[PDB]
């Protein structure tokens, strides 16, 4: 029905094709010239005294915490 | 409350959370979106409040039980 | 009559659902629901999850397993989904076991016929339409032939009209060779063979004419 890509449109045919002679927008001459190189109260409480996983990054969990409620 | 109610509520938070073809048993963590869940949250909040204030200061803020 | 879905799982219905699941898989619950005139998507999915899925089990628990269960109850209080998972069983069954331990047909046939019809019909409308057009086209062709043949019998020779070419560079392949990529140039001589094959071809043509 509608199918994955396997054998790409090979520019062999586009080479043997005739020229168009259209003038595209970007092929207008931009940067003509090249550059070059040189060369009491506190007692009474109950309690008185990196990973390479995008789904487990500290940034990530934090982000999720931020952006859910 | 009567233990049966408690049992029910605990069992309700433990649901399977389907979203868009992925599920999981919500083994640990209250679900806000139950109707009563608010009450549970509030009750849990009380615990936290007590921890913060202690028995004495909390008792004062509440006042005497009778009045 | 239109109405709110629910009810009880008749065995035929269950079977149908199973079939659907085999067909469409465990995450297209809408379609499967649609296949069942009575039961909802959610209902269906739940049923599959809970009762119908074969990678569950309903065998009784061993004494060790019983111990594990009741111990879990003691330790995880009535978080039965979690408990179920721990057991490796479905939850309702587990709960039931725990509790134990502590102490018309015309309609059905309609949906069946419809169901089987659907499951044995696995193509989008584009496909169906295409095959329809193909057979129609074939029919048209044969009718045309019958006319042409009829006229030949009658004595009027009519050449068959070309396909009304869609574009300027559209190809008829009988005109001339498709894209004659010739054989690799001959090391061994090929002349007699060329002749013989030519003769065979011409002979074949003659035969066809006579046929």
């Amino acid at each position: 029905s509608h199918r994955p890509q396997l054998e790409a449109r090979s520019g062999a045919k586009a080479a043997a094709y005739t020229p168009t002679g259209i003038e595209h927008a970007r092929l207008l001459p931009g940067h003509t010239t090249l550059k070059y190189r040189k060369f009491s109260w506190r007692k009474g409480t109950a309690f008185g005294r990196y990973i390479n996983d995008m789904t487990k990054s500290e940034y990530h969990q934090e982000f999720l915490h931020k952006h859910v409620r | 409350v009567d233990p049966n109610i408690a049992d029910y509520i605990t069992a309700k938070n433990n649901v399977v959370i389907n979203f868009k073809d992925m599920s999981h048993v919500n083994k640990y963590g209250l679900i806000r979106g139950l109707k009563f869940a608010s009450f549970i949250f509030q009750y849990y909040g009380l615990v936290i409040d007590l921890l913060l204030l202690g028995q004495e200061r909390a008792t004062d803020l509440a006042g005497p039980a009778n009045n | 009559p239109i109405y709110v879905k629910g009810g009880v799982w008749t065995n035929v219905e269950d079977q149908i659902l199973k079939a659907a699941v085999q067909k469409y898989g465990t995450h297209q619950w809408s379609k499967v629901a649609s296949l069942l005139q009575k039961k909802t998507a959610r209902q269906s999915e739940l049923r599959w999850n809970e009762y119908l899925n074969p990678k569950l089990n309903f065998t009784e628990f061993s004494k060790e397993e019983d111990a594990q269960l009741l111990d879990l109850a003691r330790e995880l209080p009535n978080q039965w989904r979690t408990i179920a998972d721990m057991m490796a069983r479905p939850a309702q069954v587990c709960v039931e076991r725990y509790n134990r331990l502590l102490e018309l047909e015309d309609e059905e046939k309609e949906m069946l016929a419809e169901a089987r019809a659907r499951l044995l019909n696995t193509q989008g409308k584009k496909a169906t339409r295409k095959i329809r057009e193909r057979m129609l086209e074939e029919s048209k062709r044969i009718a045309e032939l019958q006319k042409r043949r009829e006229l030949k019998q009658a004595g009027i020779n009519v050449a068959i009209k070309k396909p009304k070419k869609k574009y300027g560079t559209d190809i008829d392949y009988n005109e001339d060779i498709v894209y004659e990529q010739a054989p690799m140039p001959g090391i061994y001589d090929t002349s007699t063979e060329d002749r013989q094959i030519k003769k065979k071809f011409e002979q074949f043509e003659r035969k066809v004419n006579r046929k």
Side-chain angles (χ1 to χ4, degrees), chain A residues 1-22 24-69, chain B, chain C:
Chain A
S1 289
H2 61 60
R3 288 175 150 182
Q5 194 266 337
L6 28 77
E7 177 180 14
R9 176 40 174 284
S10 302
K13 281 86 74 178
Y17 283 180
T18 312
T20 172
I22 204 159
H24 288 271
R26 304 180 194 184
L27 252 300
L28 272 174
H31 301 260
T32 51
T33 55
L34 300 175
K35 299 284 190 68
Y36 280 104
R37 302 265 187 178
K38 176 261 178 186
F39 283 93
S40 59
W41 67 277
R42 304 192 290 116
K43 297 288 289 184
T45 56
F47 300 116
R49 300 174 161 285
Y50 181 89
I51 300 183
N52 188 22
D53 267 308
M54 292 296 302
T55 58
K56 305 183 185 179
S57 181
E58 292 168 26
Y59 163 70
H60 172 52
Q61 289 171 23
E62 188 165 4
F63 162 97
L64 281 182
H65 189 261
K66 172 173 272 74
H67 298 105
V68 164
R69 203 266 166 282
Chain B
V1 306
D2 181 279
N4 283 297
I5 271 174
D7 298 337
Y8 172 95
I9 286 184
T10 51
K12 185 69 73 62
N13 288 337
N14 184 206
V15 277
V16 182
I17 295 303
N18 273 292
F19 168 70
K20 301 270 279 191
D21 84 44
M22 65 183 83
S23 83
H24 62 277
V25 174
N26 195 330
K27 297 170 186 81
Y28 177 87
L30 175 145
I31 296 160
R32 280 73 56 84
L34 288 39
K35 290 285 158 193
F36 59 81
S38 61
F39 173 84
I40 307 311
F41 168 99
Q42 292 298 121
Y43 169 65
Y44 204 81
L46 181 57
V47 174
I48 288 165
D49 300 335
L50 292 178
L51 295 179
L52 288 162
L53 306 179
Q55 183 57 36
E56 186 178 26
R57 195 49 180 181
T59 296
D60 292 315
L61 278 181
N66 59 358
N67 193 190
Chain C
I2 69 94
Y3 69 108
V4 308
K5 297 181 168 285
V8 191
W9 294 98
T10 175
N11 189 221
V12 70
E13 190 168 67
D14 222 27
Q15 214 192 333
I16 296 153
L17 178 144
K18 185 165 271 206
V21 174
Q22 284 184 17
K23 167 79 174 288
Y24 311 121
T26 180
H27 311 105
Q28 290 194 341
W29 291 99
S30 58
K31 301 197 187 174
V32 42
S34 87
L35 179 35
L36 307 184
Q37 292 182 333
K38 306 291 174 290
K39 312 294 284 191
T40 334
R42 203 79 188 76
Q43 292 289 108
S44 162
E45 194 262 328
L46 161 141
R47 183 63 173 177
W48 164 262
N49 233 134
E50 203 65 30
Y51 190 88
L52 207 268
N53 181 16
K55 71 176 275 283
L56 311 169
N57 60 332
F58 304 134
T59 55
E60 70 174 28
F61 303 167
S62 59
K63 189 167 174 290
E64 307 308 322
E65 283 293 309
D66 288 319
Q68 196 161 26
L69 179 275
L70 63 97
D71 182 47
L72 278 158
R74 182 178 288 102
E75 68 225 355
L76 294 177
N78 48 69
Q79 321 176 19
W80 292 110
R81 293 292 189 176
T82 310
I83 297 160
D85 209 59
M86 287 331 94
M87 292 276 90
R89 276 58 170 272
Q92 190 66 57
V93 169
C94 142
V95 177
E96 286 167 346
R97 185 76 196 81
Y98 167 76
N99 210 330
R100 177 62 171 185
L101 191 141
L102 260 60
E103 203 73 3
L104 179 83
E105 83 181 357
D106 182 51
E107 189 65 22
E108 99 189 343
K109 285 169 173 68
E110 191 75 44
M111 63 194 289
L112 258 287
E114 191 164 304
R116 187 69 92 166
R118 293 152 67 81
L119 291 184
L120 289 268
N121 286 332
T122 67
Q123 299 302 326
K125 295 189 295 194
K126 188 70 85 195
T128 311
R129 279 179 70 267
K130 199 65 210 298
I131 63 169
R132 167 192 315 290
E133 284 194 333
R134 209 178 303 284
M135 66 169 65
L136 290 159
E137 184 59 31
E138 178 75 349
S139 300
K140 183 259 189 68
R141 192 276 300 242
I142 53 188
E144 195 275 316
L145 284 185
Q146 284 293 328
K147 295 169 186 174
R148 187 262 180 187
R149 194 167 294 99
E150 178 170 22
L151 267 71
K152 190 169 184 180
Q153 281 284 321
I156 297 169
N157 298 123
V158 178
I160 299 159
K161 284 193 183 292
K162 278 188 175 176
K164 288 192 175 183
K165 63 193 175 179
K166 297 176 181 183
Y167 49 99
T169 69
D170 189 10
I171 309 91
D172 174 4
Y173 309 94
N174 295 5
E175 286 180 11
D176 276 296
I177 302 148
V178 176
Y179 284 97
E180 194 194 36
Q181 187 62 236
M184 199 64 67
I187 292 90
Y188 304 120
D189 199 4
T190 74
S191 66
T192 53
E193 291 179 358
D194 278 320
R195 288 189 194 81
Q196 188 186 354
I197 194 59
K198 200 169 282 167
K199 177 257 177 282
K200 192 175 186 298
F201 188 68
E202 196 170 324
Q203 191 276 129
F204 182 72
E205 295 299 310
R206 282 188 192 180
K207 193 182 78 170
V208 171
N209 203 338
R210 181 173 281 185
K211 178 192 189 186

